[PDB]
Amino acid sequence: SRGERSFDIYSRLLKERVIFLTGQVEDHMANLIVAQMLFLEAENPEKDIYLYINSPGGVITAGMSIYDTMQFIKPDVSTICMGQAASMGAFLLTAGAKGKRFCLPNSRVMIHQPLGGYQGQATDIEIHAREILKVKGRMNELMALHTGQSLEQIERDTERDRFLSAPEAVEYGLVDSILTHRN
Amino acid sequence: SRGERSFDIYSRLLKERVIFLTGQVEDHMANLIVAQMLFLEAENPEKDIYLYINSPGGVITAGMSIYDTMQFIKPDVSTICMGQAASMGAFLLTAGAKGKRFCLPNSRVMIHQPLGGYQGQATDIEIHAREILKVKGRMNELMALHTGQSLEQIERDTERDRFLSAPEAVEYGLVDSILTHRN
Amino acid sequence: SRGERSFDIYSRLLKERVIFLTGQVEDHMANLIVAQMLFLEAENPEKDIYLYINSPGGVITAGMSIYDTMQFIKPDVSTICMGQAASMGAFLLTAGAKGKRFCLPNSRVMIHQPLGGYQGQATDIEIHAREILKVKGRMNELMALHTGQSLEQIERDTERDRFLSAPEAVEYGLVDSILTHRN
Amino acid sequence: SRGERSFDIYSRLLKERVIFLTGQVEDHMANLIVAQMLFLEAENPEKDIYLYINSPGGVITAGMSIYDTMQFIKPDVSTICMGQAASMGAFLLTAGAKGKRFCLPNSRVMIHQPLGGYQGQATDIEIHAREILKVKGRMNELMALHTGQSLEQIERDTERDRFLSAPEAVEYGLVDSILTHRN
Amino acid sequence: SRGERSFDIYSRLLKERVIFLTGQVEDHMANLIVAQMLFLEAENPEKDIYLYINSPGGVITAGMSIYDTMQFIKPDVSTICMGQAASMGAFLLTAGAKGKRFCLPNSRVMIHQPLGGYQGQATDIEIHAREILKVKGRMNELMALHTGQSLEQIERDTERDRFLSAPEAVEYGLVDSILTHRN
Amino acid sequence: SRGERSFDIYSRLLKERVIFLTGQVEDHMANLIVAQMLFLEAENPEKDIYLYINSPGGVITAGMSIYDTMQFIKPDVSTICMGQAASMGAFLLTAGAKGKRFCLPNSRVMIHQPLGGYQGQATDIEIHAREILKVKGRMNELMALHTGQSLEQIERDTERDRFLSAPEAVEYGLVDSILTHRN
Amino acid sequence: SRGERSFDIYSRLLKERVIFLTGQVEDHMANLIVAQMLFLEAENPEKDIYLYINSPGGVITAGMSIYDTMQFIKPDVSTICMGQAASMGAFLLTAGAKGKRFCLPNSRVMIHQPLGGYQGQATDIEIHAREILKVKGRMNELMALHTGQSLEQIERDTERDRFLSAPEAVEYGLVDSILTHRN
Amino acid sequence: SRGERSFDIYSRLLKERVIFLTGQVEDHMANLIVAQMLFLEAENPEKDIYLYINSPGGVITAGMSIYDTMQFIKPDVSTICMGQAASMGAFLLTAGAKGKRFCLPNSRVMIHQPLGGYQGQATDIEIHAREILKVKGRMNELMALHTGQSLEQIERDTERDRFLSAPEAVEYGLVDSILTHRN
Amino acid sequence: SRGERSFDIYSRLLKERVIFLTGQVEDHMANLIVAQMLFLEAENPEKDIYLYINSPGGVITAGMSIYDTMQFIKPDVSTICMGQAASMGAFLLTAGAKGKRFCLPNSRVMIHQPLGGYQGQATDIEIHAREILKVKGRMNELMALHTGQSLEQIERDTERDRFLSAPEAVEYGLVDSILTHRN
Amino acid sequence: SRGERSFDIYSRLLKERVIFLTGQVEDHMANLIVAQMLFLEAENPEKDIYLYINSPGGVITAGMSIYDTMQFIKPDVSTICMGQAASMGAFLLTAGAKGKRFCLPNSRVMIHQPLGGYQGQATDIEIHAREILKVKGRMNELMALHTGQSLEQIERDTERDRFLSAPEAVEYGLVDSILTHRN
Amino acid sequence: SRGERSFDIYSRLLKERVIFLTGQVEDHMANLIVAQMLFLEAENPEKDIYLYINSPGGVITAGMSIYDTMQFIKPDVSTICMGQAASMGAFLLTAGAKGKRFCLPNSRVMIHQPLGGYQGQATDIEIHAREILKVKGRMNELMALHTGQSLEQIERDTERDRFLSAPEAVEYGLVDSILTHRN
């Protein structure tokens, strides 16, 4: 019911360089993660950052504010998918430092093309349409970048939703390894 | 409120080959108009039909169904505008029989480009966007045709909402004359 | 609960050359009045038509389809105000054939400038605000025409709502005389 | 629920020169009443008309149109109150042909000053508050007239809601007598 | 307001063997059409029946009740698209009698695949998924059949919406010719 | 928009012994069907009746009204599935006179177990549960009867939804044959 | 109303290694449980952790994020069901450290197959159907693992909802023993 | 309005081993109670815990989490009723430590059978109905046990709501005595 | 905009042994009052307690929690009515320690009988109606006891709402005196 | 759930002279940003201030509160866009200290003219249209100032929505450069 | 998602005698400003206080509670408009200490007459209209006083909304100077 008030469980883990990305990606929650990554880089630009991800996706622009932050800060951002990472969630997971992107045994990944909609004069309709297509292109290219797949396989694999088990995500190049380490 | 139960005032006028297009154009009010047209035709393939227009516009697909009917039938469909004839209302107005298109002293005419919208994957967004642009083109061609304005002239003029007074609709070629005839 | 049936009180009265203008002027009720006039002209182009008015105003363009119809048909159109005639109602009342416009003893007349509104890009806001100023001028003129008042007096008098008693509407020139006829 | 059909109960009573005013006085219901009255006169300029009133009152201009019509036609309009005659209801009841104004034994009549309201710029508020003030005076003038009460006495009596039994109404002058005729 | 009465306009045209399919296809509007068809077969099993179509589609099973009736009855059912004809509506248009499937000059046609959905246990989801798939093959074979296009050409082409102009439909083989027959 | 009048489309067909079951089955629409069946039997006990079914199913109690009336009247009741006959709709389809139960080419039939639900004290929950279980068995017994399937079969096959094409239905004994007779 | 202000009652029990799973499983609450588990593992990697479960189930993805964490952390996680543990709650209950899974005497457990629902194109329906089915298999497999039951047994037993008392849960293998230790 | 800020009057009393059960029972408030009891046990396993009860009852699975905790902890849980203890509340009241259960002079108790409900397929209805019947028996058994009443006696007496005054509740064995101790 | 924070105005007053019962009595606000009293008694078993009351009353069981506690605790509980003490509010006031029950000068007290309302089967309607009659009896005896009036007198006096001024309340025995001590 | 509570992540960054502008610009978030800027200045007048921007746009007046404050304080305010800067967002981005305006590699920028609306008398509509136009002018000028494009170029480019990638914004003079700085 | 926690930015600024006025004026935000003013005066009755104004206006009565407090306290209140100051917002800006009222360069100011609206009896309507007028006279009197304009000038200027750019506000006498101080 409350952020565990032992000092706030989330603040407790942040000092262990752990950041959670959960639920719908949107401007405010995205801003909150940018702030956290900034403060950790401030604490120490050499130590890795661990970003946990459980997300059905969300607003792209907001996801990109997180994306650019990850690439720009000095510390390596290791991504860990628990539960799911769909659409923009799956993009941010493959955005982690190569070699440091993981999936948990039973997590699921889902990738797809962008969604949008506009209403107005046809002229305006053409402008907003040309825009979403550019964004799709940029996104498709970045995905091919982080996964190793061609631009064509990606464009083909994102036309309609596509699911991946954890192993399939590894073979796909979305993620590097699977974290099992039991006990 | 409903028909002036003398028969119904509107029914009384149909026997004089008179028809009315009032309010928002849409499938049902449209089919109704088409019915009176095929009907008046079956009754007499040579006498004129008179279609009065007072509309703010409506569904393009619904308006073209009327358009094509006007064109297809033998009787000349004389067009008269009272109150207003905006958007698709202005389209059907100028689509009347040549020399038989009229405007009342204080009617307000207005033209513009297609309105539309959509929501979905960018791949489907492109499909519907490209579609409305084709409609924009077809319509532009038809306007140029009935008005005698160059295609580009039409394009330049319908990019943003354009109003014409009765004296102006005539100089523009949207209608042939103004019915003043006092008393 | 419904129209009185002697043969529909309204059609029955229409045979006496009587038409009623009641409540909100809007497209459909405006159209019903137009068909009726048309009809009464076809019946007898020489005999006067009587239009009772009890309305608070309405959609200008709708009222204009009626204005133009009155001016255009052969038979003079006499106007009688009962209850009230405000905004478009007052206008249509003063638009009756010269010498055939009346106010019942306790009618209440009201004149004012047009009301309108828009939302959108400033370029569009400017297009629409321009149109609305044209109409206001058209209306100021027509009204100066029928009342015999000066265009400036009209403007001056219509910037803010102005109420007139039946004996004031006669003096202002809005109406020819006051019918009383007791019994 | 629906009208009883021997030939529509009301129409049937209309030929007998009987007319009903029930419920809220509002424009459309009022026009229907005017229509019927004009019809009866057009059928017989000399025979009396019967107007039953069971109403809580309503829109003043709507009722005033009925009032002017009553005073205007050749045939006297006899008024009979059943249930209640409140506000505009009481007004039109007292407005019937002197000598032919009735209350039924358990009728209830109530009189009060006009109610209304505005919203806007203070200059505007002033113009409307002055208009309703005029109508209040007019209404009092007319009531003093019909009841034979002094205008000052009327004014005083109408500030707050005042209830009148059928007998108290006859004594006040609002009505001529109680209709009784049993068996 | 009402269907134009010169004895109910739609009834009049019905006797001239004309039926209208307008707006959304759902059970009851479908039942109405099936009935008028059966009625005309009965009336004269040899003459042509004319089905005008202006629709975006709707419920499949309901469209099928109309499809199977057209096929069964003796008289040839000619189809004429006016306005639009998308999804089920396009299917029905191409279902008409060969050599008798028409398109108006500016009519717009759009073909696509079946839409649907479920909520429940996974076992139940499997069942409804399998069903919708079979209805897909079925619908493709039937369209293949009517157009002359191959099954695959039909599959490929309908996987996502596909709009077609009148000449394009006449060349895809949805419609046979275009009714220009001007005036 | 309205029931077509050659003399009411559905009446016109009633006289030729055709009756339609369209939409969700519920008391009132069921009542209308019962009334029509009674009417026809009362017109000629020896002529067959035709019941066209296109329904998703509905209230069991109400469908059973139609079912019992089918078995009781003297005329054989021939059932024709068009569109779909799902649940209680399929039930009533198979209840037609043996040898006169038909599926149109693309008709979709669907069979299943009953649905229900209660809220309240456990004692009453027990009562109501027990009742639907009784109705389940009865419905199974009867379906077995009309189809020729073993009770165990019918039980097995109906715990979860089951779809059937016209030919599978025939095969199943739910229907006798498929109607195709073209032209 | 609020928590126990004595420095937050729950943080207090957290410091004794106790975590509560209460209500519907969903992303955010599930994230809070993951935080606490890591925090506890940090505090001490070999001491046991106690997860109290009182839940009706919920979103699978959110629950699986919990599953993977329990398995990944070094500490053994003992699970205790108080109240209920239905669907995913039960799935997480059995997921506890073998020998350390408990049920309070009157807790109820319930297991069932996955629920779900999509809306869309048939091509997208098959994709979502394939995925949900894959999920079912993985889920039965894992359950058979912790219960010691055969995969066909579980498939058989989860087709429809199955309830179990504490004793039946122990004897079934979802939990090891019942906790009672009265006093 | 707020939690009495003298360190929260509730937290304060908690140090006097005082817990309060108030309002409707459900998962979260129930969890708050479990937490408090566990903390108190730990705080001192041989000291008595006082649980006040003013509740109309609520969710059974939730109330049972409390019941099983009361039995488990080493400290005796004394139950005290104020206001009311209805259904599950009364159940929990009688579950207090023998010799340690009370009612205030004007407290009112009420017992009744379980309430429940379902919607769905008959097969499921039976599964869900069979389970509420089992929980009811289980409930009747624990009640007989704490009251000393016979199973059959509880069964009969709980069929419909049965109210008990404090004096009556002592006699029924639901509670041990009545707290009065004035001043 | 919050409790005045000089240390939380209410907590601070609690130190002066002052407690407030404001507005609607309901389970939660009542519990808060109980906790306060038990706290104070615990702090000093001997000194008076002051319960200010400004209530229109509320739920009976809720107020009874409070009453029974007032009588239980050793400390006397002086009551002071400010604003109003209606229904249950008036009850709690008269229940204060004899001699220590006060009313402020312009306080209003209102006494009445219980209000209730049930929905269901006749047998249940009876079990419930009977219970409310008992509570009414129990309440009347208690009020009689505290006021010194006869049981029969309170019974007469409370059938319909009874308002009493502060001087009237003192005469009735509801309150002992009126606090005024100004300066 | 809460802004990461390690002294609040945002306040922590605030002492590092960072300020975030996220989501819709509106009076209140605007004010918050004005206070932070004035605070930073008071802290140290010559140290740069960093303002992150991720906004879809918003209220002009609100945004100008920020703009005017930025220019007015002594410290330079460097601007950084993450996610997007559309309309007023974009405008405030280019309003940053010359040489100190940046874009992350994947940000999107969009520029356009003012949106607005009014409803009222024609005299007030003009008043309001004039004002919005004045604002369009003023903003177009400031836009030219900061970017280095001609006034005419800005106008030609803001008439309809115009999107720009990060490098495109660099070449347009809206931002000085792109940040990428990896590791 | 919470006020800037560096000790609460506003209080931080409050120690610097900075008070903010943002959004619609109403009783509570105004009471807050008054309190901040009283407090600051307490601290030092000689020093200046700074009131930042960004407002569309609001409740007059709330505004005057602020206006009167400003004239009353010992310290000078300098007013600084940012964004906008319309109606009551503008009135309070011109009320600052003569010589200490400023506009940021792009501040937009708006002046107009009072707004209002009553509902009720004509007698009351007049009481309320005469009141809004006195307030209007008083607001104009005070406006002239502060700006240095004549009463008659202010009246002419406030009969309809009048916008002022920062420079015009200065030229008009509403504000003393513009603030620009850069860097």
Side-chain angles (χ1 to χ4, degrees), chain H residues 2-177:
Chain H
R2 60 153 42 254
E4 279 294 294
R5 268 306 178 161
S6 62
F7 158 61
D8 183 24
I9 196 81
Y10 292 149
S11 306
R12 219 299 164 198
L13 295 197
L14 180 52
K15 79 202 311 164
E16 286 325 335
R17 323 213 103 219
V18 172
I19 303 190
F20 297 87
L21 172 341
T22 300
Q24 168 82 12
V25 344
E26 141 280 344
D27 291 346
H28 298 109
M29 67 85 86
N31 191 355
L32 200 68
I33 284 181
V34 171
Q36 279 168 96
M37 294 196 302
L38 290 177
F39 163 85
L40 291 179
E41 172 183 47
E43 276 270 314
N44 185 334
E46 265 59 69
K47 295 211 80 174
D48 288 357
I49 300 176
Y50 316 96
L51 176 66
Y52 283 77
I53 300 167
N54 184 359
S55 168
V59 187
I60 279 180
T61 147
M64 296 311 285
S65 67
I66 302 181
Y67 179 78
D68 286 345
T69 297
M70 298 190 265
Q71 313 316 313
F72 196 105
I73 63 175
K74 321 103 162 189
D76 278 352
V77 183
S78 171
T79 50
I80 302 181
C81 174
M82 53 173 211
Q84 71 180 358
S87 319
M88 187 55 100
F91 174 72
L92 299 177
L93 180 65
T94 204
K98 172 88 176 195
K100 290 164 176 175
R101 300 167 301 172
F102 307 89
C103 268
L104 268 312
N106 306 81
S107 310
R108 309 314 262 211
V109 176
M110 184 241 274
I111 61 195
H112 68 186
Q113 62 180 109
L115 291 159
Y118 191 71
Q119 279 280 344
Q121 287 192 304
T123 299
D124 292 324
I125 287 172
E126 190 212 301
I127 289 156
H128 284 273
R130 178 173 70 245
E131 172 74 0
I132 192 179
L133 286 181
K134 286 180 163 183
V135 171
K136 177 186 190 165
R138 189 61 30 198
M139 290 316 293
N140 282 336
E141 305 175 20
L142 309 173
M143 174 126 58
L145 218 87
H146 278 95
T147 59
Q149 295 288 321
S150 79
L151 182 45
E152 301 93 334
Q153 179 59 211
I154 300 304
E155 304 177 326
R156 187 222 306 161
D157 296 346
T158 56
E159 210 66 10
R160 304 183 84 91
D161 313 310
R162 168 85 89 271
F163 291 94
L164 301 91
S165 76
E168 297 172 336
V170 177
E171 170 236 59
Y172 197 87
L174 270 160
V175 93
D176 304 290
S177 67

Side-chain angles (χ1 to χ4, degrees), chain B residues 7-122:
Chain B
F7 179 9
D8 161 47
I9 198 64
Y10 295 115
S11 300
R12 213 303 151 205
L13 286 216
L14 183 63
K15 76 199 310 125
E16 299 320 319
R17 315 222 98 212
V18 186
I19 313 195
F20 292 97
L21 179 322
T22 310
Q24 201 68 29
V25 30
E26 155 272 350
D27 293 21
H28 298 115
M29 68 86 81
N31 187 329
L32 206 59
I33 274 147
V34 171
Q36 292 157 100
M37 283 188 333
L38 297 181
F39 177 79
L40 280 190
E41 176 177 56
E43 291 278 304
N44 197 310
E46 283 89 9
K47 299 181 66 188
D48 274 8
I49 297 184
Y50 316 96
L51 171 74
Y52 283 76
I53 300 166
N54 183 352
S55 169
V59 182
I60 285 190
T61 211
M64 297 317 299
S65 75
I66 310 167
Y67 178 81
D68 290 340
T69 301
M70 275 183 275
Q71 306 320 335
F72 189 89
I73 71 169
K74 315 150 199 160
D76 278 1
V77 183
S78 182
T79 52
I80 305 181
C81 172
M82 46 181 212
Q84 72 176 323
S87 322
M88 187 55 116
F91 187 74
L92 300 174
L93 170 62
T94 205
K98 197 57 178 204
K100 293 175 167 176
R101 303 173 298 154
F102 304 88
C103 238
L104 242 41
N106 304 99
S107 26
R108 247 72 223 157
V109 184
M110 189 240 252
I111 54 178
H112 69 186
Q113 69 177 96
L115 289 180
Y118 189 74
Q119 281 272 334
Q121 288 178 314

Side-chain angles (χ1 to χ4, degrees), chain J residues 8 11 32, chain K residues 1-6 8-10:
Chain J
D8 185 59
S11 323
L32 188 62
Chain K
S1 312
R2 51 163 63 245
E4 274 286 327
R5 280 306 207 143
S6 72
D8 172 51
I9 203 70
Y10 292 117

